[PDB]
């Protein structure tokens, strides 16, 4: 369970980067 | 496109709050 | 909705980044 945790959250971030700077290049439309 | 984004962090803020929970499950069980 | 948008993917960071530094000190307690 930990194992699967510590990956489960480092993959959450990723994709709030991701998704923040889709959000960024929304605001530039 | 939008909507598309909304979706997507609506979707990560639930995984978010659930590891939330996850986390807390698991500080008791270290701690007791 | 753009605001409302924004305020919801600062919200998730700070979250995620929350959650890292609780992975952190558990697996030290770990």
New interface residues.
Partial sequence: ??KQ??D???E??S???H??N??AR??K?
């Fill in positions: 369970r930990m945790l510590e489960k959250v480092e959450l971030l994709k709030a980067y998704l923040e889709e959000v929304l605001k439309l």
